[PDB]
């Protein structure tokens, strides 16, 4: 039923990037893992939703 | 020996001259017909003609007038660098 | 004749709308029945004008 | 005589001129005149502009896409823009309905198709379904 | 012992010829990417306008094609490949049409690339392909089409 | 001649190299090149890295898990990363479609498979389904 | 045509260029010997081209091409007829 009604979508989990500055507790402006956002992401997974 | 040349436009407006009188317009009435004339480019009536102001409406009845000769006035500054050896 | 007068009118004008927000934007369906292959189609949006 | 109008008859010619890229001018009934064009570059598509006046240092034509229909082209009058004359200064234009008295002093309605003039500006009209000329005074405009 | 060559339907590329056929009144057939495959005709008689129909078949005595007015667009003709009805037909829906480039297996166990230049079918319906650089004809099962 | 490419044919060898732990380099079509690896330690699982450049004091490769499919390995080109040369400076790479005139001055399409060069940099090409060499000028790129 | 024009000279200065590299002088040491070079013609180290300055210190370095530099800025107006 879920596969029948859903739409194909890519799913990637989230995790805090190591680039977070230990003292201010806030991230670097530009690094490959996260492009300014304070959160990184894992490799995509395919799913229907 | 000219080394670098740059050209810059300060102003770009339209000035109207009367073919017969040879004067420039300075003022117009409610109907946009001429109220006054002046023989001075610096004091003449002007329509802005930078890129954003093209295709205006305020002076349609003026432009169509055959006695008037529109003129495109442009003011420029150019910078020329030189080298003259030792 | 009406140089110095107050004129009052009743008028009819054509109806006009603009889009302020989009509500229930995208609705989807993988239509497959009686098709050579699966197809994606966008169902009606709802607009708040 | 005056040659202010040079209407195109065949749409094939219109398309040929469009392939050449020359701008067109298409008339409308109780509506603004329009210009039409073929886009340059890789993708060829029809463009339109509501700007009629000539390109100038103070006036630049604005072009946009449109899904023009051949039905308008095949029906409405079409001209080369640069060759078009804005007006022909006569009392009754062509295709204008007038009432005239025939040769036997009987009155009939007609529409006008002629452009003739002397060198002073005196104009004459020849009516559809008629041969001889009719003056500005003889003809009478037929009210809608 | 085979049927004579069968021709592919040539898409008309230039607008001028398409209008010329349309002015003469010869029927066109347009494929729309989104909606459908349609016929286009300029109206008979003096009341001239463009007409569209979806009765995609030869005008049989028992199959009367029906027309309705539509404001066909120039851009529609340009972007969408168009055919003449007299050619586009079920008579040939060949998998690899003429001028198609394919990869074919050679006698030396090497896969070379060649273009189809002539097409004919045997009485059993199998399509024989003539390829550039080759003399004999080739079979559909032997071939491979490389896309992109 | 030049040996810039040493493609692996058998996946069994690829798995054997993976068991040895050497990094791989897998090509993609209209997409970024990727590196693949087997994880060390107790648990053995495939890892990937989007970092192509060599490990350095200013550049460290980033590895993450992935459920890689054998279908990509068996189909796509694979190389040992350290042995790979970034490019071979020729006009038409291998497996590039070109149009050439055959010996009887008849024109045919072909794809390229050869790497030969003198010591000056002059290159020659041998076409699939062909034997003799063809110059950079003789061949013509076939547009998509 | 030209309706009004005037030319004014903003600056007259001497600039230093290396004879070997051809790069102009960007920064110098305590005794005006070069420490940095730059390709820029205008950002180059410059000094007024006046006789008094010469007597007040070209003097210091050998890989040295002391070049003169002048700037012209021109104000002009046109009435382009139709
Ligand atoms: Zn980060």
XYZ file of C-alpha atoms and ligand atoms in Angstrom:
703
model
C 0.000 0.000 0.000
C 2.801 2.428 0.866
C 4.690 1.517 -2.304
C 1.449 1.870 -4.264
C 0.552 5.371 -3.070
C 4.016 6.773 -2.440
C 6.475 8.656 -4.606
C 10.077 7.615 -5.199
C 12.478 9.675 -3.114
C 16.092 9.799 -1.965
C 16.753 9.620 1.774
C 19.920 10.761 3.542
C 20.485 10.702 7.286
C 21.874 13.666 9.212
C 24.766 14.033 11.641
C 26.617 16.982 13.149
C 29.711 17.829 11.131
C 33.138 17.520 12.804
C 33.917 21.039 11.569
C 31.991 22.540 14.506
C 34.272 24.932 16.349
C 34.776 23.404 19.830
C 34.688 26.766 21.622
C 31.870 28.711 19.941
C 29.953 25.509 19.223
C 29.225 26.729 15.695
C 30.396 25.576 12.280
C 32.857 26.533 9.590
C 31.403 28.603 6.766
C 32.425 26.255 3.947
C 33.652 22.669 4.122
C 32.941 19.769 1.747
C 30.796 17.852 4.236
C 28.449 20.774 4.957
C 28.401 23.995 2.936
C 27.884 26.288 5.914
C 25.022 24.410 7.534
C 25.923 23.058 10.942
C 24.820 19.535 9.971
C 26.378 16.990 7.625
C 24.639 14.176 5.760
C 25.265 10.534 4.890
C 25.237 8.880 1.468
C 21.774 8.834 -0.105
C 19.416 5.886 0.221
C 16.509 5.171 -2.106
C 13.009 4.794 -0.708
C 9.331 5.155 -1.579
C 7.308 7.516 0.589
C 52.398 55.570 -26.252
C 48.902 54.957 -24.872
C 48.864 52.145 -22.310
C 45.342 51.932 -20.837
C 42.167 53.618 -22.058
C 38.855 53.558 -20.201
C 35.640 55.297 -21.251
C 32.870 56.188 -18.798
C 29.463 57.773 -19.394
C 28.315 60.364 -16.866
C 24.932 61.357 -18.312
C 22.769 60.511 -21.312
C 19.672 62.598 -22.010
C 17.726 63.928 -24.987
C 17.561 67.621 -25.898
C 15.166 69.117 -28.442
C 16.065 71.942 -30.830
C 13.678 73.944 -33.004
C 14.656 73.695 -36.668
C 13.661 77.281 -37.459
C 14.376 79.230 -34.276
C 17.456 77.088 -33.424
C 16.685 77.430 -29.716
C 16.329 74.644 -27.181
C 13.123 74.068 -25.248
C 13.156 74.836 -21.524
C 9.508 74.561 -20.471
C 6.145 73.213 -21.626
C 2.480 73.672 -20.763
C -0.205 71.319 -19.438
C -0.609 69.984 -22.990
C 3.202 69.625 -23.238
C 3.348 72.371 -25.864
C 6.269 74.760 -25.604
C 6.017 77.579 -23.070
C 9.586 78.867 -23.349
C 12.884 78.553 -25.208
C 16.528 78.857 -24.202
C 19.837 79.021 -26.071
C 21.777 77.020 -23.479
C 22.465 73.288 -23.500
C 22.945 73.252 -19.720
C 19.500 74.773 -19.054
C 17.509 73.060 -21.808
C 14.639 70.679 -21.181
C 15.860 67.104 -20.817
C 14.376 63.632 -21.054
C 16.435 61.032 -19.141
C 17.785 58.389 -21.499
C 19.756 55.963 -19.377
C 18.860 52.355 -20.034
C 16.075 52.076 -17.459
C 14.214 55.144 -18.784
C 13.969 54.209 -22.469
C 10.564 54.091 -24.171
C 9.027 56.967 -22.227
C 5.543 58.479 -22.463
C 5.846 61.976 -21.011
C 6.907 63.624 -24.286
C 5.027 61.771 -27.036
C 3.200 64.899 -28.181
C 6.574 66.663 -28.207
C 8.515 64.085 -30.222
C 5.891 63.780 -32.955
C 6.142 67.545 -33.522
C 7.910 68.019 -36.845
C 9.382 71.438 -36.036
C 11.434 69.898 -33.202
C 14.778 68.152 -33.743
C 15.631 65.657 -30.970
C 19.311 65.485 -30.049
C 21.057 62.779 -28.033
C 23.360 64.450 -25.504
C 26.087 62.341 -23.902
C 28.729 63.332 -21.359
C 31.865 61.245 -20.960
C 35.078 60.904 -18.987
C 38.021 58.924 -20.364
C 41.199 57.939 -18.519
C 44.406 57.588 -20.541
C 47.577 56.204 -18.955
C 51.017 56.933 -20.406
C 54.584 55.692 -20.084
C 57.414 57.902 -21.325
C 60.580 55.909 -20.665
C 63.439 57.168 -18.535
C -19.478 73.225 -17.461
C -18.138 71.237 -14.485
C -14.970 73.256 -13.862
C -15.527 73.409 -10.090
C -17.751 70.476 -9.139
C -17.695 67.097 -7.415
C -18.496 64.157 -9.692
C -19.618 60.790 -8.321
C -19.893 57.540 -10.246
C -20.944 53.920 -10.107
C -18.864 51.619 -12.264
C -18.421 48.004 -13.332
C -14.947 46.494 -13.622
C -13.581 43.115 -14.644
C -12.514 40.664 -11.961
C -8.835 40.062 -11.249
C -6.840 37.893 -8.864
C -3.207 37.407 -7.903
C -1.546 34.498 -6.127
C -0.652 35.206 -2.494
C 0.105 31.663 -1.335
C 0.051 28.168 -2.808
C -1.927 25.632 -0.782
C -1.674 21.866 -1.312
C 0.873 22.590 -4.010
C 1.848 19.287 -5.624
C -0.171 16.073 -5.847
C 1.105 13.065 -7.746
C 0.214 9.738 -9.323
C 2.206 6.980 -11.033
C -0.283 6.212 -13.800
C 0.518 2.794 -15.273
C -2.757 1.145 -16.302
C -3.216 0.911 -20.074
C 0.151 2.548 -20.728
C 3.286 1.318 -22.511
C 5.163 2.148 -19.311
C 4.848 4.061 -16.064
C 4.151 7.789 -16.325
C 4.209 10.656 -13.827
C 1.421 13.242 -13.828
C 0.828 16.351 -11.722
C -2.648 16.622 -10.222
C -4.385 19.973 -9.665
C -2.891 22.545 -7.347
C -4.960 24.700 -5.008
C -4.367 28.453 -4.966
C -5.121 31.107 -2.360
C -5.870 34.318 -4.240
C -1.537 57.785 -57.228
C -0.044 56.692 -53.885
C 1.576 53.378 -52.920
C 1.279 53.660 -49.126
C 0.100 50.030 -48.812
C 1.665 46.840 -50.190
C -0.358 44.002 -48.646
C 0.951 40.451 -48.813
C -1.484 37.936 -50.316
C 0.254 34.572 -49.898
C 1.187 33.292 -46.447
C 3.982 31.324 -48.133
C 5.654 34.636 -48.930
C 5.121 35.760 -45.327
C 6.874 32.642 -44.059
C 9.633 33.217 -46.610
C 10.109 36.781 -45.368
C 10.026 35.450 -41.809
C 12.777 32.993 -42.716
C 14.680 36.004 -44.044
C 14.081 37.562 -40.622
C 12.416 40.794 -41.726
C 9.936 42.279 -39.275
C 6.222 42.207 -40.083
C 3.306 44.460 -39.180
C -0.108 42.881 -38.614
C -3.310 44.881 -38.314
C -6.037 44.232 -35.753
C -9.714 45.168 -35.565
C -10.517 47.679 -32.815
C -7.171 46.789 -31.251
C -3.572 47.930 -31.264
C -1.277 47.227 -34.186
C 1.363 44.554 -33.589
C 4.759 43.562 -34.972
C 5.886 39.960 -35.458
C 9.315 38.393 -35.815
C 11.247 35.133 -35.949
C 13.726 34.617 -33.144
C 17.445 34.354 -33.975
C 19.898 31.815 -32.648
C 19.699 28.066 -32.233
C 15.990 27.892 -31.386
C 13.559 29.361 -33.916
C 10.267 30.621 -32.506
C 7.896 33.492 -33.172
C 8.251 36.710 -31.190
C 5.983 39.737 -30.899
C 6.388 43.369 -29.894
C 3.777 45.975 -29.047
C 6.266 48.731 -29.959
C 5.472 50.233 -33.353
C 7.763 53.253 -33.548
C 11.118 53.029 -35.281
C 14.204 51.862 -33.424
C 16.174 54.841 -32.157
C 18.668 56.052 -29.579
C 15.717 56.851 -27.276
C 13.422 53.971 -28.267
C 14.170 50.234 -28.285
C 11.731 47.529 -29.337
C 10.719 44.945 -26.731
C 10.315 41.367 -27.972
C 8.738 38.365 -26.245
C 7.615 34.873 -27.177
C 4.102 33.965 -28.247
C 2.221 31.042 -29.770
C 0.968 32.964 -32.780
C -1.736 31.325 -34.877
C -1.618 31.104 -38.666
C -5.319 32.003 -38.680
C -4.491 35.595 -37.764
C -1.759 35.733 -40.414
C -3.822 34.243 -43.233
C -6.793 36.533 -42.504
C -5.482 39.866 -41.216
C -3.595 42.340 -43.368
C 0.198 42.006 -43.283
C 2.982 44.343 -44.386
C 6.719 44.764 -44.273
C 7.223 47.105 -41.331
C 9.861 49.395 -42.832
C 7.873 49.770 -46.065
C 4.655 50.724 -44.265
C 3.315 54.280 -44.366
C 1.537 55.272 -41.173
C -1.539 56.808 -42.821
C -3.067 57.856 -46.131
C -4.765 61.224 -45.515
C -8.179 60.740 -47.114
C -11.694 61.233 -45.782
C -12.855 57.629 -46.266
C -10.184 54.888 -46.024
C -10.299 51.751 -48.122
C -12.913 49.149 -47.163
C -15.081 51.940 -45.725
C -18.824 51.726 -46.368
C -20.394 54.717 -48.130
C -23.708 55.550 -49.791
C -23.583 56.748 -53.400
C -26.053 57.539 -56.171
C -25.662 55.381 -59.267
C -25.626 56.702 -62.823
C -29.445 56.606 -63.024
C -29.760 58.720 -59.841
C -30.678 55.676 -57.743
C -28.909 55.279 -54.413
C -26.824 52.229 -53.511
C -24.352 51.327 -50.769
C -20.728 50.497 -51.520
C -17.254 50.119 -50.035
C -14.204 51.958 -51.333
C -11.165 50.504 -53.104
C -8.933 53.096 -54.824
C -6.073 55.514 -54.212
C -5.645 58.296 -56.780
C -4.542 61.899 -56.383
C -3.350 64.895 -58.333
C -0.264 66.824 -57.234
C -2.383 69.241 -55.150
C -3.970 66.628 -52.875
C -7.377 66.270 -54.547
C -8.514 62.670 -54.078
C -10.881 60.408 -56.016
C -12.549 57.125 -55.045
C -13.692 54.094 -57.032
C -16.322 51.935 -55.363
C -16.448 48.154 -55.139
C -18.754 46.971 -57.891
C -18.173 50.240 -59.768
C -15.814 51.597 -62.425
C -15.855 55.404 -62.529
C -14.463 57.684 -59.839
C -16.366 59.413 -57.039
C -15.376 62.589 -55.229
C -15.025 63.253 -51.516
C -18.265 65.261 -51.552
C -20.321 62.774 -53.578
C -19.708 59.881 -51.189
C -21.443 59.766 -47.811
C -20.173 57.699 -44.894
C -22.540 54.909 -43.851
C -23.009 54.923 -40.081
C -22.587 51.641 -38.224
C 12.698 -14.238 -52.540
C 11.876 -11.099 -50.558
C 9.749 -7.974 -50.701
C 11.086 -4.823 -52.330
C 12.644 -2.137 -50.103
C 10.292 -0.289 -47.756
C 10.850 3.439 -47.324
C 10.998 5.304 -44.032
C 8.808 8.331 -43.382
C 10.882 11.485 -43.790
C 10.261 14.138 -41.107
C 9.898 17.555 -42.713
C 12.545 19.861 -41.265
C 11.942 23.238 -42.931
C 8.879 25.339 -42.133
C 8.563 26.791 -45.640
C 7.838 23.474 -47.348
C 5.384 22.485 -44.610
C 3.323 25.638 -45.099
C 3.497 25.134 -48.863
C 1.996 21.657 -48.541
C -0.571 23.049 -46.115
C -1.566 25.832 -48.511
C -2.095 23.246 -51.249
C -4.280 21.369 -48.761
C -2.158 18.236 -48.372
C -2.665 16.716 -44.932
C 0.054 16.879 -42.279
C 0.564 14.631 -39.252
C 2.114 16.064 -36.083
C 3.313 14.259 -32.966
C 2.952 16.220 -29.728
C 5.395 15.163 -27.017
C 2.858 15.662 -24.233
C -0.629 14.913 -25.521
C -1.077 13.045 -28.799
C -0.464 12.432 -32.485
C -2.729 14.579 -34.651
C -3.501 15.474 -38.254
C -3.523 19.056 -39.524
C -5.428 20.416 -42.517
C -6.302 23.812 -43.948
C -10.025 24.073 -44.476
C -11.470 23.373 -47.941
C -13.579 25.955 -49.691
C -13.122 29.693 -49.436
C -13.664 29.856 -45.653
C -10.012 29.372 -44.816
C -8.734 28.276 -41.414
C -6.687 25.507 -39.824
C -8.337 22.268 -38.703
C -7.206 19.433 -36.440
C -8.331 15.819 -36.189
C -7.385 12.714 -34.215
C -8.853 10.137 -36.631
C -5.468 8.563 -37.346
C -6.156 6.243 -40.268
C -6.589 6.232 -44.021
C -9.937 7.653 -45.104
C -11.749 4.372 -45.634
C -15.314 4.343 -46.917
C -16.346 3.183 -43.425
C -13.936 5.537 -41.579
C -14.871 9.197 -42.016
C -12.273 11.600 -40.649
C -13.796 14.443 -38.633
C -12.319 17.935 -38.377
C -12.586 20.762 -35.848
C -11.176 24.280 -35.897
C -8.036 24.945 -33.877
C -5.563 27.816 -33.721
C -2.405 25.896 -34.617
C 0.799 27.593 -33.499
C 3.921 28.199 -35.568
C 6.181 27.111 -32.713
C 4.292 23.814 -32.495
C 5.215 23.056 -36.103
C 8.860 24.036 -35.606
C 9.621 22.098 -32.430
C 7.610 18.948 -33.182
C 8.752 16.705 -36.016
C 5.966 16.543 -38.597
C 5.167 14.073 -41.369
C 2.982 13.823 -44.446
C 0.099 11.411 -43.906
C 0.800 9.590 -47.171
C 4.100 8.264 -45.746
C 3.666 7.890 -41.979
C 1.808 4.603 -41.570
C 1.831 1.193 -39.917
C 3.358 -0.170 -43.139
C 6.754 0.217 -41.444
C 7.512 0.538 -37.729
C 11.046 -0.783 -38.122
C 13.019 -1.034 -34.892
C 16.144 0.576 -36.389
C 15.163 2.991 -39.199
C 17.286 4.200 -42.082
C 20.266 6.437 -41.270
C 20.404 4.868 -37.801
C 23.871 4.042 -36.475
C 24.168 0.586 -34.918
C 26.807 -1.749 -33.520
C 26.967 -5.029 -35.439
C 28.978 -8.198 -34.858
C 31.506 -9.005 -37.577
C 32.920 -12.349 -38.680
C 36.199 -11.629 -36.862
C 34.393 -11.473 -33.484
C 34.743 -7.683 -33.471
C 31.813 -5.333 -32.909
C 32.023 -2.512 -35.456
C 29.703 0.487 -35.812
C 27.873 1.159 -39.072
C 24.861 3.032 -40.430
C 21.777 1.447 -41.974
C 21.485 2.561 -45.604
C 18.830 0.270 -47.113
C 15.893 -1.659 -45.670
C 13.850 -4.523 -47.102
C 11.853 -7.385 -45.611
C 11.471 -11.027 -46.523
C 8.025 -12.546 -46.956
C 8.191 -13.589 -43.284
C 8.564 -9.968 -42.134
C 12.214 -10.086 -41.046
C 13.949 -6.813 -41.940
C 17.196 -7.023 -43.912
C 19.652 -4.184 -43.271
C 22.383 -2.880 -45.565
C 25.341 -1.375 -43.713
C 28.139 0.956 -44.753
C 31.391 -0.896 -45.323
C 29.568 -4.227 -45.738
C 28.221 -6.032 -48.803
C 25.719 -8.578 -47.489
C 22.599 -7.745 -45.491
C 22.176 -8.058 -41.731
C 19.408 -9.280 -39.426
C 17.712 -7.443 -36.568
C 18.652 -9.974 -33.879
C 22.338 -9.699 -34.777
C 22.384 -5.926 -34.361
C 22.789 -3.667 -31.340
C 21.901 0.025 -31.074
C 24.145 2.121 -28.837
C 22.273 5.113 -27.408
C 24.125 8.210 -26.200
C 52.944 4.108 -27.660
C 51.482 5.083 -24.268
C 50.221 2.857 -21.440
C 48.095 5.420 -19.576
C 45.227 2.921 -19.135
C 45.286 -0.622 -17.733
C 41.622 -1.642 -17.475
C 40.658 -4.699 -15.456
C 38.577 -7.261 -17.360
C 37.667 -9.873 -14.742
C 35.685 -8.906 -11.650
C 37.356 -11.841 -9.884
C 40.637 -9.951 -10.129
C 38.914 -6.813 -8.820
C 37.677 -8.719 -5.779
C 41.159 -10.181 -5.343
C 42.686 -6.697 -5.401
C 39.964 -5.570 -2.999
C 40.918 -8.410 -0.664
C 44.478 -7.108 -0.943
C 43.044 -3.730 0.075
C 44.308 -1.647 -2.841
C 42.161 1.333 -3.777
C 40.182 1.277 -7.022
C 39.015 3.976 -9.419
C 35.668 3.534 -11.172
C 34.515 5.707 -14.051
C 31.009 7.113 -14.434
C 29.044 8.447 -17.399
C 28.357 12.191 -17.222
C 29.171 12.000 -13.516
C 32.099 12.410 -11.168
C 34.804 9.782 -10.890
C 34.744 7.700 -7.708
C 37.155 5.634 -5.622
C 36.222 2.367 -3.909
C 37.784 0.468 -1.028
C 37.358 -2.424 1.387
C 37.132 -1.454 5.033
C 39.837 -2.656 7.448
C 39.327 -4.165 10.866
C 36.969 -6.825 12.142
C 34.028 -5.957 9.883
C 34.642 -6.019 6.130
C 32.426 -3.740 4.055
C 32.802 -1.581 0.972
C 33.659 2.097 1.357
C 33.659 4.946 -1.148
C 35.307 8.348 -1.417
C 34.556 11.251 -3.728
C 38.128 12.527 -3.246
C 40.286 11.751 -6.270
C 43.478 13.696 -5.609
C 46.465 12.025 -4.000
C 46.803 11.829 -0.234
C 48.963 14.672 1.037
C 49.794 16.856 4.015
C 47.060 19.270 2.856
C 44.592 16.715 1.467
C 43.087 13.676 3.206
C 40.654 11.240 1.618
C 37.191 10.930 3.170
C 35.703 7.427 3.287
C 32.137 6.330 4.039
C 30.064 3.176 3.763
C 27.911 2.280 0.785
C 25.978 -0.686 -0.584
C 27.855 -0.840 -3.867
C 26.396 -3.040 -6.592
C 28.437 -5.528 -8.608
C 26.548 -4.342 -11.695
C 28.495 -1.080 -11.683
C 31.779 -2.942 -11.186
C 31.209 -5.548 -13.889
C 30.123 -2.917 -16.439
C 32.036 0.303 -15.767
C 35.754 0.686 -16.361
C 37.964 -0.025 -13.343
C 41.607 0.769 -12.616
C 44.170 0.673 -9.863
C 44.126 4.226 -8.536
C 47.869 4.761 -8.132
C 48.570 3.356 -11.608
C 46.023 5.622 -13.306
C 47.117 8.525 -15.503
C 44.749 11.475 -15.327
C 44.501 12.086 -19.082
C 45.898 11.101 -22.468
C 46.268 14.339 -24.464
C 44.696 13.440 -27.807
C 41.969 15.100 -29.852
C 39.565 12.135 -29.863
C 39.683 9.781 -26.839
C 39.088 6.064 -27.136
C 35.492 4.953 -27.734
C 34.799 8.300 -29.430
C 32.635 8.237 -32.558
C 34.192 9.720 -35.703
C 33.423 9.803 -39.422
C 36.126 8.535 -41.779
C 36.486 7.801 -45.485
C 37.286 4.178 -46.283
C 39.971 3.051 -48.716
C 37.577 3.359 -51.684
C 36.754 6.989 -50.766
C 33.385 5.999 -49.289
C 32.478 7.474 -45.916
C 31.692 5.355 -42.857
C 31.291 5.985 -39.130
C 33.587 4.399 -36.563
C 34.801 4.544 -32.968
C 38.455 4.795 -31.993
C 40.604 2.178 -30.254
C 44.368 2.870 -30.378
C 47.160 4.759 -28.634
C 50.332 5.324 -30.667
C 52.747 8.243 -30.749
C 56.185 9.250 -31.917
C 58.593 11.021 -29.569
C 57.376 14.460 -30.738
C 53.711 14.002 -29.802
C 52.251 13.158 -33.221
C 49.340 10.771 -32.669
C 47.677 8.136 -34.852
C 44.319 6.372 -34.512
C 43.058 2.942 -35.555
C 39.298 2.611 -35.898
C 37.075 -0.199 -34.666
C 36.476 -2.492 -37.611
C 39.627 -1.145 -39.286
C 43.327 -2.006 -39.461
C 45.391 0.920 -40.759
C 46.024 4.155 -38.887
C 44.186 7.460 -39.264
C 45.522 10.917 -38.484
C 44.061 13.644 -36.298
C 43.073 15.625 -39.402
C 41.538 12.719 -41.328
C 39.073 11.820 -38.578
C 36.040 14.009 -37.912
C 34.148 13.991 -34.624
C 30.564 12.750 -34.927
C 28.197 15.111 -33.121
C 25.695 13.610 -30.697
C 30.778 67.070 -32.671
C 32.501 68.428 -29.564
C 30.663 71.187 -27.706
C 32.997 71.513 -24.714
C 36.240 69.853 -23.660
C 38.994 70.219 -21.070
C 42.057 68.153 -20.155
C 43.515 68.093 -16.637
C 46.577 66.157 -15.479
C 45.838 64.428 -12.181
C 49.322 63.115 -11.414
C 52.926 63.147 -12.599
C 55.139 60.573 -10.923
C 58.161 58.300 -11.325
C 57.712 54.521 -11.122
C 60.348 51.813 -10.656
C 60.530 48.668 -12.792
C 62.958 45.762 -12.584
C 65.113 45.283 -15.676
C 65.265 41.480 -15.347
C 61.784 40.338 -14.312
C 59.962 43.390 -15.645
C 57.774 43.394 -12.538
C 57.140 46.791 -10.997
C 58.021 47.674 -7.420
C 55.313 47.013 -4.819
C 57.155 47.294 -1.487
C 60.687 48.271 -0.471
C 63.035 47.867 2.481
C 64.443 50.393 4.966
C 66.635 52.013 2.282
C 64.055 51.775 -0.521
C 65.565 48.557 -1.904
C 62.876 46.250 -3.222
C 61.328 43.498 -1.123
C 58.208 42.773 -3.229
C 57.417 43.046 -6.935
C 54.072 43.258 -8.717
C 52.915 43.081 -12.319
C 50.443 45.946 -11.871
C 51.434 49.128 -13.689
C 49.327 51.458 -11.525
C 49.633 49.859 -8.077
C 53.413 50.105 -8.528
C 55.401 52.194 -6.066
C 55.484 55.758 -7.371
C 56.773 59.176 -6.353
C 56.217 62.715 -7.672
C 58.217 63.583 -10.792
C 59.691 66.804 -9.417
C 63.303 67.972 -9.369
C 63.329 68.559 -5.611
C 62.357 64.947 -4.928
C 65.302 63.705 -6.992
C 67.647 65.768 -4.823
C 65.810 64.262 -1.829
C 66.329 60.644 -2.954
C 66.934 55.658 -9.063
C 69.618 56.242 -6.450
C 69.416 52.979 -4.555
C 69.247 49.879 -6.777
C 70.900 48.562 -9.939
C 68.224 46.222 -11.334
C 66.246 49.436 -11.669
C 64.499 51.109 -14.606
C 63.168 54.437 -13.252
C 60.130 55.138 -15.422
C 57.990 58.269 -15.590
C 54.209 57.986 -15.297
C 51.481 60.477 -16.205
C 47.686 60.350 -15.902
C 45.292 62.166 -18.241
C 41.589 62.534 -17.440
C 39.422 64.258 -20.034
C 35.954 65.781 -19.691
C 34.015 66.101 -22.943
C 30.466 66.539 -24.215
C 28.891 65.810 -27.599
C 25.785 66.871 -29.491
C 25.175 64.019 -31.930
C 22.790 65.242 -34.596
C 20.024 63.092 -36.002
Zn 31.269 20.922 8.191
